[PDB]
Amino acid sequence: KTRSSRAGLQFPVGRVHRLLRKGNYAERVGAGAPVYLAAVLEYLTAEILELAGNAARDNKKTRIIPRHLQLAVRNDEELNKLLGRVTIAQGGVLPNIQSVLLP
Amino acid sequence: DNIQGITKPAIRRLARRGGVKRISGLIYEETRGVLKVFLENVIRDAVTYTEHAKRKTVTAMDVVYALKRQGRTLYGFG
Amino acid sequence: DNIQGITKPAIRRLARRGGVKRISGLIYEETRGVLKVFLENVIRDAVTYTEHAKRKTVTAMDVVYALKRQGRTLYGFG
Amino acid sequence: ESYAIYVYKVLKQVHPDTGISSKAMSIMNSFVNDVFERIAGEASRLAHYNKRSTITSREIQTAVRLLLPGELAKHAVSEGTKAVTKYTS
Amino acid sequence: DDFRDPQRWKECAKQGKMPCYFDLIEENVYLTERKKNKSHRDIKRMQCECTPLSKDERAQGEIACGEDCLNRLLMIECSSRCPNGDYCSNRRFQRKQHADVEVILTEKKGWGLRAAKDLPSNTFVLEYCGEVLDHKEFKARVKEYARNKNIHYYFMALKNDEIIDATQKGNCSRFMNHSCEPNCETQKWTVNGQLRVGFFTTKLVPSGSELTFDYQFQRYGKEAQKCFCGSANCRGYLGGENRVSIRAAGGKMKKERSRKKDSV
Amino acid sequence: GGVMKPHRYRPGTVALREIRRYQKSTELLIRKLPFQRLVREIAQDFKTDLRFQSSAVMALQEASEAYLVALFEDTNLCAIHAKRVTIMPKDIQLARRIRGE
Amino acid sequence: HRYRPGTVALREIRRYQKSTELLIRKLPFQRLVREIAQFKTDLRFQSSAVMALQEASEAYLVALFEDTNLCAIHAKRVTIMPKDIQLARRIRGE
Predict the structure, then answer these.
(1) Measuring CA to CA, which residue among A2, A24, A25, A26 is closest to residue A13?
(2) Which residues pair with F52 in a beta bridge?
(3) Helices (H), F1-101
(4) Which residues in chain B touch residue A101, judged by CB atoms under 8 angstroms apart?
(5) Where are the glycosylation sites (chain D)?
(6) Where are the beta strands (DSSP E) in chain B?
(7) A 4-63: CB under 8 A from F
(8) Are C and E touching by the rule of 3+ CB pairs within 8 Å?
(9) Who has the most CB within 10 Å: A58, F75, G13, G67?
């Protein structure tokens, strides 16, 4: 049976194992590293998709769009810090107007 | 002179997206030069990658790698 | 409360090296906070490296790596 | 090959009745690849300062703690620990 | 004095006491409306950014969407998707919140309006409603109607190619006069994607005082007209002295890129 | 008898309206064919007789628009710090100097 | 005898841009580090670690004050103000 089924995850452990053994990072890899990394990636993916889904429901839509991803990422304190130097295509900016320009 | 193709109202449009209320008359000539320098750097790096890869066509992955080299990661064109 | 040990003359001397002629009376409380944040970040990274290395003593190479992580790249300490 | 079907499987667990566009799928693919590269590179760095052959779960955990912010890293570590416990138990 | 009744009566033209010689009008009507606009592609919704409470009114209760809303400052009324819902106060052209008006005789210059009760600044009074013309019909109907010897021309240019006629059908805003000391004015609000013209006050108008608005001066034929107010500097004349052309009066059409022939 | 026009927008009102209109949307603001011609012209200086991918030009356009938007976002703060509404090239230069360009 | 206000300021600017020594006192800096390093209780330090921390900190502060001075001059002021530091750290990306 698949290692993912043993670990209770959703991302595939074996492909991560292969990429670690293939990407010239070190001489050896311990058995727990791919499972740990897959759990981390699954958690981050789930967080991003949760906030994207909330942003999508906030605009009466049923399909997540890059604008929704942009809003979800930029309206969070820590994800913005993690992705501060990343440009999302077809993402746009946050609506804000400085208070010294409004009449 | 294709640098004049980047129109005055186009630059005004970009400023409107950036949140600028009133635009001076030299911002356009400044922005043209800034964009020219930025594009020259990125294109130089991209063409370098291509010539290394022995290709004649310039792929989009080359542009992505050049932007990563500059330090501006771009999601979507992978 | 050892952040008060970064004295007004010390900050003034640093500004003089920076090229400042006239200094407001409110610069010091801001400078102390900025220094505290910077030191907290760097020391956090250093202590993390130490705890990974299974060491009681925080080495200088740990500090150098912590600075390299943030993009400072100090020379002179190995 | 990519992570698209797995992203679908993750999405259907946190929002049942929703969809996602291909551009967003590509963006998520890039995000997964980028985080994978960051964590792997940091672990490969950590394994060299101590002159060790093997990247272990401890190495990955150290990289995670160094790379992610405060509240996010704690949950990431907890999830990874739970998974690596369930892997052997 | 207004007495809006649907039965036509025995008052010829002056419309001072019997308003049923012509017809009244609701929100305006169009003739050649096509689906080429910014209606529902980029102005689908322009929602304000408000985090209200809406559970505490009449006691520590702030009115919803006051002068701190993002839409009121930019002259846009909210849609039905407002977070306040049916408590937002921007939708004044849709709930038909109007001011108390009355039409009687003041001066021999013509009919007009006088304020019933006290009215503060930045208060809506009436919406200008009429019949929307188009490119070709304006320059024909105007020369067809100039030979009918009429004094009042109810033409107002919405855009460089749109002129609204308030002659065949008009609301209570057709009687307001001109003066060189304006206390009311006209504003260009955007409701439901369409542009509408409204009337706002500027000061604290006392009960029983005049309510006129300033004309952006314009003349159309060879003759001239003059104003009879004379507040302190009154320019003497409606339309000033300078003459402008048929196209400049209406705003000269956005020429369909056919041909030169049309200019000649 | 003449055709009177209602009124004129106060300046800055439509400017702010445009600010909202273009901050709400997500589209390309730059003329695509001129952008393409410009890229080809400036690429001719590094290798004669090249060929491009459509996505390779689209990515360049996205990056350029993002860069300019960020530059203006910082420049507006510079101008406001200068207690001005109008935006000046000295503000642009200060933004680039402090950013490190 | 008095030197006019600003003259000695320029004198200090010259002499402290000429010198290369450290400006912050070692014992207070050390006490500060060993206080805010309490992360992990009961730590030990190499001296070169603190020596490097002081160098990095003074370099960072000088580099920040340079941009602060630039902002103050752009504002047509001589005196630097905390709003200038805030603008500098806002544009810098912090």
Answers:
(1) A2
(2) B58
(3) 13-24, 32-43, 54-81, 89-99
(4) 21
(5) 78
(6) 22-23, 57-58, 73-75
(7) none
(8) no
(9) F75
Provide the Cα torsion C12, C15, C19, C25; round to 10°. -70
Round to whole Å and give the CA distance between D35 and D77. Answer: 15
- Residues F39/F31, Cβ–Cβ less than 8 Å: no
Q: Which residues of G touch F74 (CB under 8 A)?
A: 91
How many whole angstroms separate alpha carbon E15 and alpha carbon E115?
18
B39–F64: do the CB atoms touch at under 8 Å?
yes
CB-CB under 8 Å, D21 with A53: no
Task: Judge whether G67 and G61 are in contact, CB under 8 Å.
Answer: no
Chain F residues 2-21 with CB within 8 Å of chain A:
12-13, 16, 19-20
**What phi and psi values does residue D48 have, to the nearest 5 degrees?**
-90, -30
> Which tokens hold the place of E152?
């009042």
- Domain containing A31 equals 2-87
Residue of F81, F83, F97 with shortest CB distance to G87: F81
Min Cα–Cα distance to chain C from D71, Å:
15
Domain residue ranges of chain D, discontinuous segments joined by +: 1-89
Among the partner residues B19, B71, B77, nearest to A89 by beta-carbon distance: B77
Give the E:F interface size as CB pairs under 8 Å. Answer: 70
Rounded CA-CA distance F100/G27 in Å is: 34
The verdict on B78 touching A (C-beta cutoff 8 Å) is no
Strands E163-165 and E155-157: antiparallel
Residue A31 lies in a domain: yes
* The total number of structural domains that make up chain A: 1
Phi, psi of B58 (to 5 degrees): -95, 110
- Nearest Cα residue to G66 out of G25, G17, G6: G17
Residues of F in contact with A96 (CB under 8 A): 23
Which of F13, F26, F80 is closest, CB to CB, to A92? F26
- Token pair recorded at residue E127: 């919406």
Give the tokens for residue F55: 């996505």
Q: Which residues of C touch D49 (CB under 8 A)?
A: 49, 53, 61, 65
Q: Is the CB of D39 less than 8 angstroms away from the CB of A25?
A: no
Q: Domain D1-89 in CATH: superfamily?
A: Histone, subunit A (1.10.20.10)
How many Cβ atoms are within 10 Å of E147's Cβ, its own excluded?
7
Secondary structure (3-state) at B2: helix
Examine residue F1 and state whether it is found in any structural domain, yes or no. no
Assess contact for D6 and A41: CB atoms under 8 A: no
Give the CA count within 13 Å in the CB-facing half-sphere of C12: 12
Method: cryo-EM
Pairing type for strands E163-165 and E131-132 reads antiparallel
Tell me how far apart the alpha carbons of residues E174 and E131 are, in angstroms, rounded to a whole number: 13
Q: Distance between CA atoms of D58 and C52, rounded to whole angstroms?
A: 8
- Residue G85 lies in domain: 1-94
Q: In angstroms, what separates the C-alpha of F76 from chain G's closest C-alpha?
A: 11
Name the 3-class secondary structure at E114.
strand
The DSSP line for D8-50 is HHHHHHH-SS-EE-HHHHHHHHHHHHHHHHHHHHHHHHHHHHT
Resolution of this model in Å is: 3.6
The enclosing domain of A43 has a CATH number of 1.10.20.10
With an 8 Å Cβ cutoff, is E48 touching chain F? no
Tell which residue, E228, E258, E225, has the closest CA to residue E243: E225
- The interaxial angle of helices F54-81 and B60-70, nearest 10 deg, is 30
DSSP three-state, residue F59: helix
CATH at G24: 1.10.20.10
**Which CATH superfamily hosts domain B1-78?**
Histone, subunit A (1.10.20.10)
Three-state DSSP at F51 gives strand
Contact present, A87 and F71 (Cβ < 8 Å)? no
Q: How far apart are CA B25 and CA E238, in angstroms?
A: 38
Q: What is the dihedral of CA E134, E137, E138, E142, to 10 degrees?
A: -160
